[PDB]
């Protein structure tokens, strides 16, 4: 019957919810009690770049942490040189409606897809020298919330369809597609050594998946509405929300729980994209309040602050080497903070 | 460098490409279109010649881009935010849906649910200067539904008599109230016309007019 | 992706003669043209430069004045219109292609050349190396000199390498020193800074026998070196 099913299944959350108490032994914030804070974090505008015509969704550095990607409403993919402000690349979308990028960790590919329920891919090395559409990756019914290369061939992308799935470039097709998502997904992050992805939906859960096996293996709960960003912790043994609560979680893998929020009673508007430092010491998460603010990630200390935006910060991200921070908004300018 | 200075050529060159491309792309006029599954969007299309379905068409020395979303199928309020700042926002009901209901709700009209999602468009907090264009379709089964049966099974109250003069009257007026932000935005209903296929005409000359009454607006004189 | 280029043959001194290069098979409107010139028996020396949409345009100090170059890009051609030839412009011209991006390879694709016979401050790279004997499955280095130091302040290092085998069309090895081209085995390397360069070829056969070239970036006028042939 439902019924004996459900009444089994609440009983199921029970055992989870009861182990994850006597699991508590003790809160990040006592242990940490000690830490020497990190000083007030003054971070400067050091390169501005201009030439979108429209709000911009989506960033993503490069693996040399030099160049990197942006696109906007205007149809406009560009592959900005951070160092000289130059545009390397400008991509000619079919579809004006971008929700997301992705730059491949080879640097050979650039991804972009959103309300046309594809997952197109360019390719930047062409013997013709002219930024080509390699691939449209069409297998989900909603608009494309974000994307992630693995490989050259491998890219896992997350859709409104409240289905994420794993692709073939090659032969255009999901190798393996990952549901128990009961609302929109908006946002993945692949783990460092890329065997595992947490996913963040507007059912106000977080996911942790098995690229290869395609199962869920732990579901987080905790906040109070849409989860929006997600990143895990350099060491890919924790990982943090943004949500519409205006709060940020810091989850961990191994213990299954809730390690910190980062609410402060000033933060009424929703988190739109969060980002790590190098060492995991900052959390970067950019807000609604048309500014983007820096977490003392071992003491929920708002230690520092980027206010450098008229509309909203869309996408926020950091290099791989952790030299620069880059933030784009929906004024249609991207940011170097340094 | 020498290389380096073919760079910033390029970097320039890119540049005269995004500025003739930016200024073409605001010459044409952005329309968002939303409705019911039977409200007529598809009748619309016709008239104007998976995924956001997009359709070109150039009248009188003007081009028009209308965005059919209607296929999302998804949630609302994260994407709904792409679309702010479009010209105007077509929406469609049938008229002819006063005496149905959903086969898959109880007992919510198709016209109460079509109010739902306008009351949430006219008074959404991304469209609060959009006007709003309103076509109201199947006028004509509507004349002759009215015929026959009565409007008072949807509106429990009506002081009007069954005559399609009165009985549509009643209806526009009765969406048009819905909004809140009287003082900003401009509801611009017509009824679907058939043979003139002016419903074009319409459109353009309320866009025409919601860009020369905005243009009175940021301007101050108005 | 083949460059072919019109024109040549036989002029007497003083005429003016128009080369044409149809490009085909690639963006041409966004690559920036040269024309490098090989003297029968000498090696390579750069003419002329047109940038991407005809914005700068640049020449050699034998041909300032002298030569016009202009591309037509809708019809997917380069020209060169060159005036009153001298007995020293006897040479095959080459039409190269070259884009300048972040991490891009200039000079990557060279044309056929066209074969031109007239009827009768700069930096120089020097190697002191010719017809060096060598052996298939041996390893051999090629080292090369420049008069100035190459290495940018941004750390680039604007050296080049060329191979040009017997009767064939200069070939692309290193756009930039520690770098690769593309469709270039591994056996290729070279490690150098400043103005001392070197050029490794691990095993070689007898498909990459030849004469090799050094060429700068650095600045104008893209002045080239002596060859290096490979004796075998």
């Known amino acids: 019957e439902l019924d004996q099913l459900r009444q089994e299944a609440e009983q199921l959350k029970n055992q989870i919810r009861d182990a994850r108490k006597a699991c508590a032994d003790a809160t990040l914030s006592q242990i940490t009690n000690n830490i020497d804070p990190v000083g007030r974090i003054q971070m400067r505008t050091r390169r501005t770049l201009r030439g979108h015509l429209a709000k911009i969704y989506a960033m993503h550095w490069g693996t040399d942490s030099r160049l990197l990607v942006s696109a906007s409403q205007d149809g406009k993919l560009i592959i900005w040189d951070s160092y000289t402000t130059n545009k390397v690349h400008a991509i000619p979308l079919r579809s004006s409606w971008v929700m997301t990028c992705a730059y491949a960790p080879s640097g050979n590919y650039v991804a972009c897809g959103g309300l046309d329920n594809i997952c197109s891919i360019y390719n930047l090395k062409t013997r013709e020298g002219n930024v080509r559409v390699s691939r449209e990756l069409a297998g989900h019914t909603g608009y494309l919330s974000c994307c992630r290369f693995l490989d050259d061939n491998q890219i896992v992308t997350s859709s409104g369809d409240t289905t994420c799935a794993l692709w073939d470039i090659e032969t255009g097709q999901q190798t393996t597609t990952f549901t128990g998502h009961t609302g929109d997904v908006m946002s993945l992050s692949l783990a460092p050594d890329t065997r595992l992805f947490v996913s963040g939906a507007c059912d106000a859960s977080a996911k942790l998946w098995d690229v290869r096996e395609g199962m869920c293996r732990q579901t987080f709960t905790g906040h109070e509405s849409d989860i929006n960003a997600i990143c895990f912790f350099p060491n890919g043994n924790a990982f943090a929300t943004g949500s519409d609560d205006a709060t940020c979680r810091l989850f961990d893998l191994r213990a299954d729980q809730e390690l910190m929020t980062y609410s402060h009673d000033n933060i009424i508007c929703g988190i739109t994209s969060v980002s790590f430092s190098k060492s995991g010491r900052l959390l970067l998460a950019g807000y609604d309040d048309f500014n983007c603010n820096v977490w003392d990630a071992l003491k929920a200390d708002r230690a520092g602050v980027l206010a450098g935006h008229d509309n909203r910060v869309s996408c926020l991200g950091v290099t791989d080497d952790g030299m620069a921070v880059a933030t784009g908004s929906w004024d249609s300018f991207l940011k170097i903070w340094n | 460098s020498a290389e380096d200075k073919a760079a910033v050529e390029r970097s320039k060159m890119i540049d005269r490409n995004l500025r003739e491309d930016g200024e073409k792309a605001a010459r044409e006029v952005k329309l968002l279109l939303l409705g019911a599954g039977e409200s007529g969007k598809s009748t619309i299309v016709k008239q104007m010649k998976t995924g956001i379905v997009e359709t070109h068409f150039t009248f009188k020395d003007l081009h028009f881009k209308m965005f059919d979303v209607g296929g999302q199928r998804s949630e609302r309020k994260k994407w709904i935010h792409c679309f702010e700042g479009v010209t105007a926002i077509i929406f469609c009901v049938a008229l002819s849906d006063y005496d149905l209901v959903l086969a898959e709700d109880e007992e919510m009209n198709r016209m109460h649910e079509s109010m739902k999602l306008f009351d949430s468009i006219c008074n959404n907090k991304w469209f609060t200067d959009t006007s709003i264009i309103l076509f109201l379709n199947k006028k004509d089964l509507f004349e002759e539904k009215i015929k026959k049966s009565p409007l008072t099974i949807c509106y429990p109250e009506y002081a009007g008599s069954n005559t399609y003069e009165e009985a549509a009257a009643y209806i526009q007026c009765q969406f048009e109230d819905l909004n809140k932000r009287k003082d900003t935005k401009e509801i611009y209903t017509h009824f679907t016309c058939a043979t003139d296929t002016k419903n074009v005409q319409f459109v353009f000359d309320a866009v025409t007019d919601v860009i020369i009454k905005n243009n009175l607006k940021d301007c101050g004189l108005f | 992706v083949q460059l072919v280029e019109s024109g040549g043959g036989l002029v007497q001194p003083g005429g003016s003669r128009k080369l044409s290069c149809s490009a085909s098979?690639?963006?041409?409107?966004?690559?920036?043209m040269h024309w490098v010139r090989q003297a029968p028996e000498k090696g390579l020396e750069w003419v002329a430069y047109?940038?991407?949409?005809?914005?700068?345009?640049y020449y050699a100090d034998t041909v300032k004045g002298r030569f016009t170059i202009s591309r037509d890009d809708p019809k997917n051609t380069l020209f060169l219109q060159m005036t009153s030839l001298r007995s020293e412009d006897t040479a095959m011209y080459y039409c190269?292609?070259?884009?300048?991006?972040?991490?891009?390879?200039?000079?990557?694709?060279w044309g056929q050349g066209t074969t031109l016979t007239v009827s009768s401050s700069d930096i120089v790279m020097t190697q002191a190396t010719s017809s060096v004997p060598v052996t298939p499955g041996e390893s051999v280095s090629i080292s090369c000199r420049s008069s100035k130091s190459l290495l940018h302040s941004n750390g680039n290092t604007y050296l080049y390498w060329f191979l040009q085998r017997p009767g064939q069309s200069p070939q692309l090895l290193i756009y930039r020193m520690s770098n690769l081209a593309s469709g270039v085995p591994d056996r290729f390397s070279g490690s150098g800074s400043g103005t001392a360069f070197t050029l490794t070829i691990s095993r070689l056969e007898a498909e990459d026998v030849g004469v090799y070239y050094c060429?700068?970036?650095?600045?104008?006028?893209?002045?080239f070196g002596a060859g290096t042939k490979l004796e075998l």
């Open positions: 098979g690639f963006a041409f409107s966004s690559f920036g």
């Open positions: 060429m700068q970036h650095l600045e104008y006028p893209l002045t």
């Open positions: 047109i940038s991407s949409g005809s914005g700068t345009i």
């Open positions: 190269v292609r070259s884009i300048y991006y972040y991490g891009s390879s200039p000079f990557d694709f």
